Amino acid sequence: SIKVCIADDNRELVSLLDEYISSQPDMEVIGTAYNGQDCLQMLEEKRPDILLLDIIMPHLDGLAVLERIRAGFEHQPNVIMLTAFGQEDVTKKAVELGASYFILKPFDMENLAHHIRQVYGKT
Amino acid sequence: SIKVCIADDNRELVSLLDEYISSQPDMEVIGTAYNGQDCLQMLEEKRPDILLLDIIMPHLDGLAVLERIRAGFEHQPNVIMLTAFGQEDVTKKAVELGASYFILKPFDMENLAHHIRQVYGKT
């Protein structure tokens, strides 16, 4: 059971991520946060294996959170930045500190091309 | 080669759809439109196999476009409505006219759970 924590200030995205990760048979969601300060508070209690972290947030962004994780925590999760188009340059500083990243495209295409084939096939 | 036309008023979404469908080896994008009137003009020239159509658009929505396709076109594409959360009830009228539909979730999760496993695996 891979234990995952989510921290992002887009409430719609956090909800989708929680649903998606919870549907995976080998993973579990053990906490969520909407800003950096609450993320750092969560990690002190839950010790997840994986943290999905928004790279840019007002006041305390994902790189400031990652720096605090590396400078003050004994137990650190593997951090995966959530990066949208145009945010790649800022993500690169976080990869220099050892995080990994996931390019988050705006709309979900899963199963579209399968559905298209099913429709086309029936005619 | 499955020939696809896209009609939606979200420019970001049209761009992603074009990219995604064009990357499929068995499909091709042959036109795109940003409103109903331009979609109906496109279909008269291009005769696609598949039309991806936004269910709700100001002035002339996807159901009004579908009704015009069924009442005035000799050659009709198989129509797949692009339906977002909350738009299901309006889609059901279009399915009554024979269209199919695709539930469009707000963010792309493709490959996230694979990446998570790759990261977790390396430790």
Rounded distance, CA B20 to CA B107, Å?
A: 14
Q: Chain B: nearest CA to A6, how far in angstroms?
A: 13
Question: Under an 8 A CB cutoff, do A107 and B16 touch?
Answer: yes
Give the up-direction half-sphere exposure of residue B107: CA atoms within 13 A in the CB hemisphere: 21
Experimentally, how was this structure solved?
X-ray
Chain B CB contacts of A13 below 8 Å: 106-107
Tokens of B35: 């409103």
Rounded distance, CA B53 to CA A121, Å?
A: 19
Q: Chain B: nearest CA to A68, how far in angstroms?
A: 21
Residue B20 phi/psi, 5-degree rounding, is -60, -55
Chain A CB contacts of B112 below 8 Å: 20-21, 102
DSSP, residue by residue, A41-102: HHHHHH--SEEEEES--SSS-HHHHHHHHHHH-SS-PEEEEEE-TT-HHHHHHHHHTT-EEE
Range list of H helices, chain B: 11-23, 36-46, 62-72, 88-96, 112-121
In chain B, whose CA is at the least distance from the CA of A2?
Answer: B120
Domains of chain A plus CATH, in order, are: 1-123 (3.40.50.2300)
